[PDB]
Design a binder for these strands. Structure first.
Ligand SMILES: [Zn+2]
Ligand SMILES: [Zn+2]
Ligand SMILES: [Zn+2]
Ligand SMILES: [Zn+2]
Lengths: 75, 76
DNA sequence: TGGAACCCAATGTTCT
DNA sequence: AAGAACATTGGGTTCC
């Protein structure tokens, strides 16, 4: 199960086990951008169905689960 | 002259309520189609120009609450 | 694993 | 006003 949206947990992307959709969301969130504002209370439910609803909260728990575009762990 | 649903400036009065054009076609699509949306918050999401896209469930709710309806035509 | 390339759903504007 | 057509966005899977 994906540590963010708990969809089809694929295989560690950018440090964390995630679905494919969260993988791509995160690269996009970091590289491009958009300020994402939560419309609730910064604690939205992020599941398969709702991850689309709050990119702010989804992106936040990407960061908190450890996601990073650097697998430079090679050193 | 602001949309009663989302606070973006209203483009006139639609389905019975002062609204912008985004909320106008949003409400029409939701009412005529399916609107089985789920709130990822507590069914009171703030709905402004940007966040209106976040939560269709709370957006539709605010539409109904402000009184929008399709037959506001022959309802006059 | 990472990412280009789709495809697609859902939204917002235009309609000399 | 109401709504069809079109344009775009942002997003999820598919392919290497
Ligand atoms: Zn996920
Ligand atoms: Zn949120
Ligand atoms: Zn509006
Ligand atoms: Zn909501």
């Amino acid at each position: 199960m994906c540590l963010v949206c708990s969809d089809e947990a694929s295989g560690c992307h950018y440090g964390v086990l995630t679905c494919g959709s969260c993988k791509v969301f995160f690269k996009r969130a970091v590289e491009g951008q958009h300020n994402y504002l939560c419309a609730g209370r910064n604690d939205c439910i992020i599941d398969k169905i709702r991850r689309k609803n709050c990119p702010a909260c989804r992106y936040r728990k990407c960061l908190q689960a450890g996601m990073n575009l650097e697998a430079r762990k090679t050193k």
